[PDB]
Design an enzyme around this catalytic site. Structure first.
Site, PDB file in Angstrom:
ATOM      1  N   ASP B  11       0.797  -1.216   0.000  1.00  0.00           N
ATOM      2  CA  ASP B  11       0.000   0.000   0.000  1.00  0.00           C
ATOM      3  C   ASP B  11       0.828   1.262   0.000  1.00  0.00           C
ATOM      4  OD1 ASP B  11      -2.845  -1.129   0.482  1.00  0.00           O
ATOM      5  OD2 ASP B  11      -1.737  -2.006   2.148  1.00  0.00           O
ATOM      6  N   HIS B  13       0.347   3.596  -2.542  1.00  0.00           N
ATOM      7  CA  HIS B  13      -0.655   4.495  -3.113  1.00  0.00           C
ATOM      8  C   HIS B  13      -0.014   5.605  -3.895  1.00  0.00           C
ATOM      9  CE1 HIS B  13      -4.162   2.565  -1.355  1.00  0.00           C
ATOM     10  NE2 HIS B  13      -3.475   2.454  -0.239  1.00  0.00           N
ATOM     11  N   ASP B  52      -1.369  -2.451  -4.374  1.00  0.00           N
ATOM     12  CA  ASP B  52      -1.689  -1.051  -4.253  1.00  0.00           C
ATOM     13  C   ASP B  52      -0.388  -0.280  -4.165  1.00  0.00           C
ATOM     14  OD1 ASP B  52      -4.478  -1.314  -4.397  1.00  0.00           O
ATOM     15  OD2 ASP B  52      -4.829  -0.893  -2.254  1.00  0.00           O
ATOM     16  N   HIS B  88      -6.868  -1.214  -6.613  1.00  0.00           N
ATOM     17  CA  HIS B  88      -6.547  -0.052  -7.453  1.00  0.00           C
ATOM     18  C   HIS B  88      -5.798  -0.365  -8.752  1.00  0.00           C
ATOM     19  CE1 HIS B  88      -7.891   2.889  -4.539  1.00  0.00           C
ATOM     20  NE2 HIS B  88      -7.090   2.410  -3.602  1.00  0.00           N
ATOM     21  N   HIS B 191      -4.361  -0.579   6.356  1.00  0.00           N
ATOM     22  CA  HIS B 191      -3.370   0.486   6.348  1.00  0.00           C
ATOM     23  C   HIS B 191      -2.611   0.619   7.635  1.00  0.00           C
ATOM     24  CE1 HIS B 191      -5.475   2.738   2.850  1.00  0.00           C
ATOM     25  NE2 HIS B 191      -5.003   1.548   2.521  1.00  0.00           N
TER      26      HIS B 191
END
Ligand SMILES: Nc1ncnc2c1ncn2[C@@H]1O[C@H](COP(=O)(O)OP(=O)(O)OP(O)(O)=S)[C@@H](O)[C@H]1O
Ligand SMILES: [Mg+2]
Lengths: 365, 369
Positions: B11, B13, B52, B88, B191
């Protein structure tokens, strides 16, 4: 009023010459280029049920080549499982209505007054809460505050009470003839204490009183007005509970007595007049979803929204996608956009392509 | 002799631009570049990426670059890297390719089985991309092969990007029992950091790589965001041979400015702060101008200007499901009328029953007028 759409079949319906479509529950999501054929799918759903009343123009919904128009839709309502049908051959059509297999009414006018009670809202209370047409995401807030209390009075369950009011106005009719009856017999009627019919005269009179004082507990200025008031705060909770997820520069949103929207900015209050296109649509969307939650288990229906993401910018669209996903008090929300966001979050992802004037539905997932 | 260490990370992002802020964009890229650095400085034998890496499915040129560069190094310094695509990164109109494809000779994109040799010893890896809950079933299938194909080897690792029942209690697409026995579970999607025993082995969520929601800050200070360094030397593993690398993030600071005592506690945080923090929460209206004073020690003010009038909790849980029946009755009494009646008069009027009766009844029965 727990309503759900299973599938639908249509013939000669604008660009939908012929196609059937399966409605899976959850995040249903029609998608396609411009004019692919997206709204028609729900113009039709809406025909089936309530067929264009007046002898309107049938050259509107019939594929511009053709002559006939057949639509049949499948939907589970209040547990049961129904099927309505409506057609038209040059000049004349009629409507059949099956109930699990066994038809409850079989005439234009029959199936008509039948579809109103098997759903509970007329043709316009339908477009005010179950089917929200393209262009009309904000309509509600655009209403006169009487028109607002009128459509909310129905969506909440307050109308039924107004029934009970004018019912109790007829019921106070009987126990008043009865009372006149006794008055007439007791016509020609200290150490003088009250006779038996005199004692009934009295009881029956203090009865009427009680009866009326119950009529008025059903009155507009009565319990209808308590229920409402005991309702706003709650709607507000959910309104703001969702409006916030948009990250707009605003304290909270006041929901008034008469369902007016008041946007608390740091130095002042803004009305849906001052808000901006995109901003209006947000509060609009947040409010509709809001009332949905408020009657969470009082009435759990489905919803059709057509381009909810109108005017909405790149940030806001996705915030709203995140809201919809998060939404729980509705089992079927079918949504019709052409936008990327709502796609990539969708249970289903019903694709509409249009091959030269003729439209084709390729259900996905 | 015998030494095998991998870095589990998740993650990132990349490309996220929180509150439309040029800075926060850079913050996300920076905290990643840092990780790649630290990881490049640890030359671990393997890197596990749990998904992600990017934010959208069409991430911006620059994010794509910033990655292709970092992953270039990774495989230039002979580091092996595994990644499962997260939510994503899974293309929704096939024919269009996930951004991960742009890293195909730097990384292996898992949706199957594979074995890596480190120190002649053979280890087993399986993983697969984000599956909606919808297609949650076809998944169990996947984990079955995985389980089967994996029985054969001593050391096994599972990579997935889903959310799992006990760990996100809210939105999840898999449950605890819902997965087979492995040695390490390199997970993505949660997260906050997560690390704990499970089915004889360690399960892990590397967590994000910056604060993507304001609520990850309090969760950030306790456990710190970064990645997992895992020493898979000995035959088994505990929370002990899983070292955690840390990383510094843009700072957040919750002000609830009610009085003079408070406006100060708020000052006691902003300057008591590494870099320019993001401030959030409430702020009574009369203090607003004297806050804009700090508009230069601040990065952004996402706090709410509350009206002076209101002075209570609005985020306070007050579960109201107005029981129409209850209310109607409670109400009618306040007025002086047999609620238990007027209610019954009500159900009756609708079902189109015989009211005369109900009244004729009550009339004689209970009505003492
Ligand atoms: N009576 C009709 N006979 C044949 N085609 C029609 C008829 N009425 C509308 N259409 C075609 O159907 C297409 C529009 O179908 P709609 O459901 O209204 O549009 P859409 O797919 O939702 O496209 P939008 O709204 O611009 S994103 C248009 O191209 C019309 O040309
Ligand atoms: Mg349309």
């Amino acid at each position: 009023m727990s309503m759900i759409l299973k599938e639908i079949r249509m013939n000669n319906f604008k660009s939908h010459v012929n196609s059937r479509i399966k409605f899976e529950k959850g995040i249903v999501a029609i998608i396609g280029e411009n004019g692919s054929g997206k709204s028609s799918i729900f113009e039709a759903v809406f025909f089936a049920l309530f067929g264009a009343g007046s002898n309107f123009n049938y050259d509107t919904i019939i594929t511009k080549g053709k002559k006939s128009v057949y639509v049949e839709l499948d939907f589970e309502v209040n547990g049961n499982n129904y099927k309505i049908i409506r057609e038209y051959d040059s000049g004349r059509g009629g409507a059949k209505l099956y109930k699990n297999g066994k038809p409850y009414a079989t005439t234009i006018s029959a199936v008509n007054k039948a579809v109103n009670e098997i759903l509970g809202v007329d043709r316009n209370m339908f477009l005010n809460s179950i089917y929200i047409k393209q262009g009309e995401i904000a309509k509600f807030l655009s209403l006169k505050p009487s028109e607002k209390l009128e459509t909310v009075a129905k969506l909440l369950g307050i109308d039924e009470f107004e029934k009970c009011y004018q019912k109790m106005g007829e019921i106070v009719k009987e126990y008043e003839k009865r009372l006149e009856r006794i008055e007439g017999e007791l016509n020609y009627k200290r150490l003088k204490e009250m006779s038996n019919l005199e004692k009934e005269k009295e009881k029956l009179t203090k009865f009427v009183e009680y009866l009326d004082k119950v009529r008025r507990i059903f009155g507009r200025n009565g319990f209808q007005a308590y229920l409402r008031e005991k309702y706003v705060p709650l709607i507000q909770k959910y309104l703001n509970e969702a409006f916030s997820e948009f990250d707009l520069p605003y304290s909270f949103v006041e929901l008034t007595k008469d369902f007016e929207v008041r946007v608390h900015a740091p130095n002042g209050v803004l009305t849906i007049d001052n808000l901006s296109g995109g901003e209006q649509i947000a509060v609009a969307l947040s409010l509709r979803l809001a009332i949905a939650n408020a009657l969470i288990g009082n009435r759990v229906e489905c919803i059709i929204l057509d381009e909810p993401t109108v005017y909405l910018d790149e940030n806001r669209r996705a915030k709203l996608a995140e809201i919809f996903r998060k939404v729980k008090s509705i089992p079927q929300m079918i949504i019709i956009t052409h936008h990327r966001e709502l796609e990539d979050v969708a249970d289903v992802i019903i694709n509409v392509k249009k091959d030269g004037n003729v439209s084709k539905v390729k259900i996905n997932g | 002799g015998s030494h095998m260490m991998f870095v589990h990370i998740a993650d990132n992002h990349l490309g996220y631009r929180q509150y439309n802020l040029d800075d926060r964009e850079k913050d996300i890229y920076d905290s990643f570049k840092l990780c790649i650095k630290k990881i490049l400085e640890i030359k671990p034998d393997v890197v596990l990426h749990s998904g992600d890496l990017f934010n959208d499915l069409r991430p911006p040129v620059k994010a794509l670059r910033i990655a292709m560069q970092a992953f270039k190094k990774l495989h230039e310094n002979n580091i092996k890297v595994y990644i499962v695509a997260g939510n994503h990164e899974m293309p929704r109109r096939l024919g269009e390719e996930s951004p991960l494809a742009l890293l195909k000779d730097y990384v292996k994109i898992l949706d199957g089985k594979d074995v890596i040799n480190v120190n002649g010893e053979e280890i087993f890896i399986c993983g697969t991309y984000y599956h909606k809950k919808s297609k949650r079933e076809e998944m169990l299938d996947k984990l079955k092969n995985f389980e089967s194909e994996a029985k054969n080897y001593k050391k096994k690792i599972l990579m997935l990007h889903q959310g799992i029942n006990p760990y996100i209690p809210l939105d999840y697409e898999l449950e605890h029992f819902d997965l087979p026995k492995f040695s390490y579970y390199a997970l993505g999607h949660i997260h906050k950091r997560i690390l704990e025993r499970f089915n004889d082995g360690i399960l892990a969520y590397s967590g994000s790589t910056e604060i993507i929601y304001r609520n990850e800050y309090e969760d950030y200070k306790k456990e710190g965001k970064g990645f997992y360094l895992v020493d898979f030397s000995g035959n088994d593993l505990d929370i002990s041979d899983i070292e955690k690398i840390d990383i510094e993030c843009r700072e957040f600071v919750e002000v609830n400015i009610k009085d003079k005592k408070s406006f100060n506690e708020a000052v006691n945080k902003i300057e008591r702060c590494k870099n320019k923090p993001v401030v959030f929460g409430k702020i009574k209206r009369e203090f607003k101008p004297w806050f804009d004073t700090l508009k230069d020690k601040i990065l952004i003010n996402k706090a709410i200007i509350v009206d002076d009038e209101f002075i209570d909790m609005p985020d306070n849980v007050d579960i109201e499901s107005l029981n129409i029946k209850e209310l109607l009755v409670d109400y009618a009494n306040r007025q002086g009328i047999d609620g238990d009646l007027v209610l019954s008069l009500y159900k009756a009027l609708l079902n189109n029953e015989n009211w005369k009766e109900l009244l004729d009844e009550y009339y004689n029965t209970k009505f003492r007028g």
